[PDB]
Amino acid sequence: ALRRAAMSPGGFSTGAVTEENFQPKATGESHRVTRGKAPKVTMEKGPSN
């Protein structure tokens, strides 16, 4: 949950659109499956003293 929350936007934002910033959604997999589709950061624990 925290890994997903790290790579999460705050609410709905869209920004401008340009011919370079296109984000195709032809993934090659079912849109019905949502396991493993979330954006997540890699957990990184810093060293102790």
Partner: protein, 234 residues
């Protein structure tokens, strides 16, 4: 009525104004026109004090300050001019804005605090100003703003987008400087420093420092209970 002729100027004023202090050498020298050997320039300050009860001496004109003080001490008026919060707005004000900003790719989060070096700055008025300029720019569900104490204001925003975070911060700083200057100051200088946090990677803290010198502008200036018990209680 009374006509006072001084070294370089002619004046006319009222006997009651001259006799506002009947016990003084003033009322003794004006018992019901005359001439004085005090400079006409030094005379207006004394006359204004008598007519208004304000004798703010000129700091730039050290001489005329000295002669005003000398004449008032000789005539026993200094002890009345200076008889033995907003007490006074300092000639220089330092205001410090410490804001922790967390920065992800397109996301930005802010926790900002505004602090003054002195009291009397109508921080509640600044809070209302910022709320007015932000409640039309983005919903209050994202951001929050109030004063934590005297000299201190707080401004929080939960995870918010990049452009809107920039808008919120620019607006808040605009209002901070506008308020502080409008209440009788002018931004002599501004400088900032930046630090990384000891805990989180994407958070850092900005410390802005604004030094305002008094400029004396043309326009007038001014110068819930937490729960403690669950069961029924007697």
């Amino acid at each position: 009525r009374a006509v006072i002729n001084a070294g370089g100027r002619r004046f006319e004023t009222l006997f009651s104004t001259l006799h506002r202090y009947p016990d003084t050498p003033f009322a003794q020298l004006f018992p019901l026109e005359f001439f004085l050997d005090v400079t006409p320039h030094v005379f207006e300050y004394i006359l204004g004090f008598l007519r208004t009860n304000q004798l703010n001496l000129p700091a730039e004109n050290l001489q005329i300050r000295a002669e005003v003080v000398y004449s008032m001490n000789q005539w026993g008026l200094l002890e009345h001019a200076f008889p033995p919060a907003v007490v006074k707005l300092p000639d220089v004000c330092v205001v410090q804005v410490c804001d922790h900003m967390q920065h992800d790719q397109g996301v930005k989060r802010h926790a900002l605090t505004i602090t003054y070096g002195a009291d009397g700055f109508q921080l509640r008025s600044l809070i209302r100003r910022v709320r007015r300029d932000l409640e039309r720019q983005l919903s209050s569900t994202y951001w929050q703003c109030y004063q934590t104490n005297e000299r201190a204001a707080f401004f929080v925003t939960t995870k918010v987008a990049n452009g809107t975070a920039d808008l919120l911060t620019t607006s808040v700083t605009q209002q901070l400087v506008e308020h502080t200057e409008s209440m009788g100051y002018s931004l002599a200088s501004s400088y900032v420093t930046l630090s990384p946090d000891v805990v989180h990677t994407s958070v850092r803290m900005l410390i802005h420092n604004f030094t305002f010198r008094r400029s004396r502008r043309v326009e007038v200036e001014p110068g819930n209970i937490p729960t403690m018990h669950v069961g029924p209680r007697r």
